[PDB]
Amino acid sequence: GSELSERIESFVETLKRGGGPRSSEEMARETLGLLRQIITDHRWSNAGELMELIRREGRRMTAAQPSETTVGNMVRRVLKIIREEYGRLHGNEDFSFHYAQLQSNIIEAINELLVELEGTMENIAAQALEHIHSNEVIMTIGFSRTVEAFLKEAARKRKFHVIVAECAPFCQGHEMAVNLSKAGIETTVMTDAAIFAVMSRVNKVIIGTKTILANGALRAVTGTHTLALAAKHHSTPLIVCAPMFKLSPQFPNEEDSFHKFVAPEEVLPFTEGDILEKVSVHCPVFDYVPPELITLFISNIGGNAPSYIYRLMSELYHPDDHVL
Amino acid sequence: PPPLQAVLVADSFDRRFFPISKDQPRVLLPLANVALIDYTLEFLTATGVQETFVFCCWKAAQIKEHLLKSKWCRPTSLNVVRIITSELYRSLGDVLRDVDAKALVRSDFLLVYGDVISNINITRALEEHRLRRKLEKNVSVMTMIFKESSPSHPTRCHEDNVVVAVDSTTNRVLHFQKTQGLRRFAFPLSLFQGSSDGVEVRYDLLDCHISICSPQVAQLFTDNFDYQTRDDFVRGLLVNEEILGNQIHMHVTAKEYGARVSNLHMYSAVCADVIRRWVYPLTPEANFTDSTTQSCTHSRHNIYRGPEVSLGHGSILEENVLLGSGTVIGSNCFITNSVIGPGCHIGDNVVLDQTYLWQGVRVAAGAQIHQSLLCDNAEVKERVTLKPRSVLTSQVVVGPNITLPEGSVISLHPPDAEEDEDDGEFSDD
Amino acid sequence: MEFQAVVMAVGPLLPVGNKPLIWYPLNLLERVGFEEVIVVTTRDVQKALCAEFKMKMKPDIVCIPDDADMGTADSLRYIYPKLKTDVLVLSCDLITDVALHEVVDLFRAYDASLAMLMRKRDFIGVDSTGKRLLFMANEADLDEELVIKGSILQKHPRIRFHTGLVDAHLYCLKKYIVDFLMENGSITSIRSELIPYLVRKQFSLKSLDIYSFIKEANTLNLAPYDACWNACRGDRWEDLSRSSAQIVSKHLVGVDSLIGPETQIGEKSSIKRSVIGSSCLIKDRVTITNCLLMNSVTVEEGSNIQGSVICNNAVIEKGADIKDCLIGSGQRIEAKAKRVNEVIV
Amino acid sequence: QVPTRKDYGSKVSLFSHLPQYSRQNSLTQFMSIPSSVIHPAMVRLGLQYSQGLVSGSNARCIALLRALQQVIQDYTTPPNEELSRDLVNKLKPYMSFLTQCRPLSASMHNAIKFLNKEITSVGSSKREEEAKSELRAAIDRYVQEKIVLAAQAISRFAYQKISNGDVILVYGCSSLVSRILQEAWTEGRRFRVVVVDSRPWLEGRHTLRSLVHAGVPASYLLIPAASYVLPEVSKVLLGAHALLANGSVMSRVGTAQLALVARAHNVPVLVCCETYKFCERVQTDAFVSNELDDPDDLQCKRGEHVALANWQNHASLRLLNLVYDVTPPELVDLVITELGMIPCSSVPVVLRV
C-alpha cells in the first residue's frame, strides 16, 4: 500500500529525469520487478480490473518518458500474459472465473519471463559466431552492451576489424571502442561525419538499436539513419542486433516526439556567447531507420527478416494493446 | 550522511518587478505557464534535497495556498516541503538569523533564492565541498555555484556580472564584486600575498545564486546584524578574512545550466531558454508538475502546443512557441517566440513577435505586439500596435488606434505604473 | 637575415665564473642559427670593453663602444642605424637551456610583435591559453589597487595572473615597434617603459599583440652574488652539453667538477661540489668547501671554507677559517679570523 | 637541411601510405632560427599552417600567394644563372616544406602550377626589377580575377537560384557560400538557413557567427542529426574544397554523407567552386589521397573522465580522422562557377578547355 506506492513514485521519477538504471536490460528487469510487486501485493479481485489497473498504471509509466519504450513493451507483455493465462484457466469477457491460483500462475509466467530475459546476452553471444569471418570489417555506431558481448565473444575464435564510429551529439562510442580494444579486436574510431567515405571498405554493419517497431523500421541512436542509408547504397548487409524485449508494437507516425530533443547545451555549448539568442540548435538523439534498409534482426531466437516482425508482434503483444 | 536541507527564501527582497509585484509576488510568476516556485522546488527535489524550508514575507497566503496544491505538499513526495513564514524578517540576513535562532537546520543547506531556473545536479559539488570541509577542520563554509558563459550572453543583465578573482589550485574565492557601471576594476593586492600559484580572475561567470553554506555560516550571520545579502556577506568575509578566515570556495559547472530571474529582461531570456529545451529535463513537455492544464505535447520546430488550442486558418506558427490549453488563435495569424498561456484569445492578422502572455489575455484583430509581457486578463482592442518591452498588466486595457512608445508600462495602480488603465494611453482619468 | 640579434650589455665586471658570462648568450645565439650578432658596450667602466671581449672563440660579432653612460632603450636607438629587420635583443646576463625554437616560434607563429621568455612583484597577466598576455605592470606604478580595462575582460574573459615570474629579458621585436622607439624619446628603458606601454596599447586592421611564453628550465643572474653563486652551482652540471677540453691528472678528492686545462691537481685536498678549473694550485690540503673559486687563485697550507667565493687575485692560506665571505679583488688575507662577514673591498 | 617530421602514433591498416602528422612536435624545432635553407616567409607559413591557423581553402591560397609575393620581392639571381630557372629550382624545397607541414590542397596545387607556368614565360632579357614587378602584378591579377571576381559572379548567379521561404542548407566554413548568402539576403530576398557542422574541427560556427551578423536566421546541429532536418530543406549549398575530373566533388569529411542523405530525401544538391579548383586529378574513393589530422583531438571532454585519456597505451586501438571526403559525381547537381551553372559531369569539358 505504501511500500509499492513509494517504489512506483521513485521509479517514475528515476525514469522521468535521466537514464536510471543505465542498461536497458536493467530497465526491463526493474520494470518486471515492479510489475510483479503490483501483481502480487496489491488490491484486485477479477482479472478484468487487474488488466485495468495495469493499464492506468502503465499509461503513466510510459508517458513519463515517452521515448524509453522498454518499460512500455514490458507492460504490454505482462498484459498479453494476463490474457493468455485467462485463456488457459477459463476452461472475450472478464469475469472472475477463477481466483488466487491465477495469482501464483501469473507469478510463474513472470518468473519464466524474467529468467529467459536474464539469459539474453549469452544467447546472442553464443549465436554470434555464425555471422563473422576472419579479416573482415564491422561498423557499430554508438555503444550497445549487446552488440558489445556479440563482438567481444565472437573474437575468441576469429580475428577481424571493428570500425566503431562514434555518436557525435555526445561522444559515447569512445567507451565502446575502449571496451573492445581491451579485449583486443583491432578496433578503430572515427568521427561519424566519416561514414560515406569508409563505407566502401565495410563488409557488414552491426548497428545497435533501442527499439524495433512493427515494420522493422527500428528506432536507434542517432546518425544510424545515415549509416544505414550508406549501407543500403553499397548494399552491405545490416545485422541489427536487437534482443526481444526491445520490440514495441507502436507504429512510425503514431507519436510526436518520436525523437528525444535533449538539452542542446551539448551541441552548441553555452560558452558560446551572443549568437545564442537567434539560432535554434536542434538535438535529436533518436533517429528513425526506415524498414527496407534493415536486413537481419538477430533476436534471441535466431535471425529474422524485416518483413517477418509482425509475426513476432502478434506472438508477443495482443493486437488490442497498441495504445495501452 | 544526514539529510541535505535547503533554505528557500521565496521572496525577492527588492521591488524589482513593479508594478507587477503588487498583484502577486515574484515567486508565482509563470514562465512556461508554471509558477517559478515550482521550478525551484523541482530543482531541489531532482538534486535530492530532503526538505526545503520555504520562507516567505510577502503574501504568505498566496504562496502557501498555491504550494498546498503543488506536487510536493501531497504526502507522497520524497522532499517534504515545510513552509515557515512570518511578517517580521525583511532581508536574507534576517532569514539566516531566523534559521539560527529557531535552530532548525543541521548541516550543508542550500541557500537558494526563490526563483532559480536550474537543473544543476550539485551532488558532486556537494561531495567535493564536504571533502574540503572535513579535510581541514571546518574552515570552508560556503561553496557557491557558478555557470560558464561568455560575457555577452543575453541571459546576462547589467547587474549580475561578478568579476570573481579565484585561486585555481583548489578553486578558492578571493574577491567578489558586482559591476553596475564600471569601466575599471579594483583588486586589493592582498590576494597575491601568500599563494603565488596563480589567481585566475574570471569575468566569464554567471551568478547562479545556489550558494551552499554550513551552520557556521548562519552563526556568522548572527555575529553581525549588518549582513543583509549573500553578496555583501561574501564581500565582508573576504575583506576581513585575516581574522576569522572561513575561506569561501567555488565550483564552476560547464554542461549544466542555471540562472536566477532578477529583472524582466533576464526573465525574457530565461523564458526563451526554458522554452528551447536549454534546461532539459525541466521543460514543458515533461510536465514536471502533476497537472493536466499545461500538459503540453512536443512538436517540430520546438513549437509546443497543449491540448485544445483549436488554431484557425492560415495561422502559421514559426518557432519556439508554446500554447497552453484552451486558447483559440484566429485566422491569418502569425505567432513566433511567444508563450501564449491558457485561456487566451486571438484575432486576425495579429503578429506576436517575442511576446509573452499569461492567462485570460484577449487580443483582438489587427494588433501587432512585440517583446511585451501581458499579464492576467490584459485585454486589448483592435488596430493597436505595441512596441518593444511594452509591459501591460493586471486587467489593463488598450483602445483602438492608440499605439504606445517604446518602453511604456501601463497598469491600473496610479503611482507605481508609468501610466494608467483606460481606453488608451490617453484619458488616464 | 630575418633577425639581427643584438645583445644588450650595459652597466672585470661581466665575464665572471667558470666560463665568461657573455659566452652564455653568445653560445645560445651561435647554437641556433645567427651567423651574425651585434653587441653593445659603453664607457661605464671602459669604452674599450670590445678590446677584451675580442679574446673569444666565436668571432662572428660586431662590438660597438658608445658614449659615457645611458640606459637600455637609448642603446637600441643608438644602434638603430645598423638595424633593418626584426630585432632579437637579449641580456648579456642569461644562463638557460631554452629551446629558443619555442620563443621565436611563438613570435613568428601568430604574426606577433613582441615575444619574451619568462620563468616561474612584477604583476604579469597571461591569458588562458598560456601564451598571450594581457596585464603587465609592476607595483612601482600601481599603488594598492590592480586596475584592469573592462574591454580586455569582455574580450578575454579569463585573465590568469602570476606573481613571482622572473623575466629573462629575451625579446623578439618586429620592426615598427623599434621605429616607434626611435621616433620617441620619452621612453628611456625597454622592459620598464615599453612592455607596460605596449601591453597597455593592445590596439594602435593593424593590431599589435605580445606573447610571454612561460617555462621551467633555468633563469638569469645579475650582480647579486647570491644569484651568481647559485647560477654557477647550476651551470657546473648544465655544462654537460653546452671539463670538456682539459689537461689535468686529478689525483685527489674531486668529482663531477669543472676541472679545466692549464693546471695539474696534486694530492691531499677535498673540495667537491666546488668550482676550480683553469690555473689551479691544487697540491696542498684543502678542507671541505663546496663553493666557487674565481680566477687568479692562491691558497695552500691546510685551508678550509664554507660556501663562499674569492674574487680575482685572492690569497688566503695557512688555516682558513671563515664561512660565506666574498674575498675582494686583489686583497690578501692570511693571518686573521674572518667571521660570516664579507671582506674589505 | 629540412628534416621530415616523423608520423604520430599509428595509422589504420588501410592508410599506411598517408602521413599522420601531429600538432605538438612541429617542424620549427629542427631548423635554424633565422631560417637558412627555407625562407623566413615560407617557414612562417608552414608553421602557421601546421598549428592550424588558416584552414578555409581560399584563406590557404591567399596566405600562400602573399608569402610567395614576399619571396619574389626578396629573390636575388646567383651570377651566371637565369631567374626563370633558379627561381623554380629554389621554390621546390619550399613546396616540400609546405607538404611537410600540412599537405597541399587542390587550391595550392593550381596556384603553384599557375606560378610555375607563369614564371617560365618571362624573357631572359628581362632584368630582375621589371620582371619582379611583373611577377607581383601577375600574382595580383590572379588573386583578383579568380577568387575576388569569381565570388562576385558566383554570388550574382546563385542569387537567382534561391527562392523565398526555402530553408537553404549549408555545410561548415566556406568563404564562397557565406558570401553567397550574406549577399542574397541583403539584396531583397528573404529565407532561412540551417547550418550543419561536424566535430572535432567544428568549422561551422564560422558560418554561424558570420550569418547571425547579417540578420538571417540560422540553425545548427551536428551532421548526424541531418537525417532529420532534410524533410524541410529545399536546397543544399555544400562547400567544396576541391573539384576533380570525373565530376566528383572532393570536400570536407561529411559532405559525402550529407549529399547521399539529401538525395535519398529528394532535395536538390549544389556545390560552389571557382575556376581555380578544377584539377585534372581523379580519385574514385577517398582513401588514396587524404590528409590525416592530429588524431589525439577526437577525444572530447565527456563527464569528468575523458574516455580516450591514454590513447595509444591500448595495443589494437587505432584512431584516425579523414579530412577529405569525395561525393559521387551522380548526387551533385550543380557546380556554380563564374561562367554559369554547369552540371556535374560537365566539368572536364568546360573548366579544362
Residue numbers in the entry:
A (entry chain D): 8 to 98, 119 to 351
B (entry chain J): 40 to 468
C (entry chain E): 1 to 11, 26 to 134, 155 to 238, 258 to 295, 342 to 444
D (entry chain H): 166 to 518
Task: Paste lines from the article.
eIF2B is an ~500 kDa decamer, assembled from two sets of five subunits (Kashiwagi et al., 2016). It has two catalytic sites, each comprised of the bipartite ε-subunit whose two domains embrace the nucleotide-binding eIF2γ enforcing a conformation that favors GDP dissociation and exchange with GTP. Engagement of unphosphorylated eIF2 in this catalytically productive conformation depends on binding of the NTD of the eIF2 α-subunit (eIF2α-NTD) in a pocket between the β- and δ-subunits of eIF2B, ~100 Å from the catalytic site (Kashiwagi et al., 2019; Kenner et al., 2019). When eIF2 is phosphorylated, the phosphorylated eIF2α-NTD (P-eIF2α-NTD) engages eIF2B at an alternative site, between the α- and δ-subunits of eIF2B (Adomavicius et al., 2019; Gordiyenko et al., 2019; Kashiwagi et al., 2019; Kenner et al., 2019): a catalytically nonproductive binding mode that inhibits eIF2B’s nucleotide exchange activity (Kashiwagi et al., 2019).
When the apo eIF2B and αPγ complex structures are compared, the binding of eIF2(αP) is associated with an en bloc rearrangement of the βδγε tetrameric unit of eIF2B. This widens the gap between eIF2Bβ and eIF2Bδ that would otherwise accommodate the eIF2α-NTD in the catalytically productive conformation (Kashiwagi et al., 2019; Kenner et al., 2019). As a consequence, the Cα atoms of eIF2Bδ helix α3 (helix δ-α3, residues 247–267), which intensively interact with the eIF2α-NTD at the eIF2Bδ-side of the gap, are displaced 3.2 Å (on average) and its helical axis is rotated 7.9° away from eIF2Bβ (the root-mean-square deviation [RMSD] for the alignment of eIF2Bβ is 0.7 Å). (A) Overlay of the eIF2B apo structure (gray) and eIF2B in complex with two eIF2(αP) trimers (the αPγ complex; color-coded as in the adjacent cartoon).
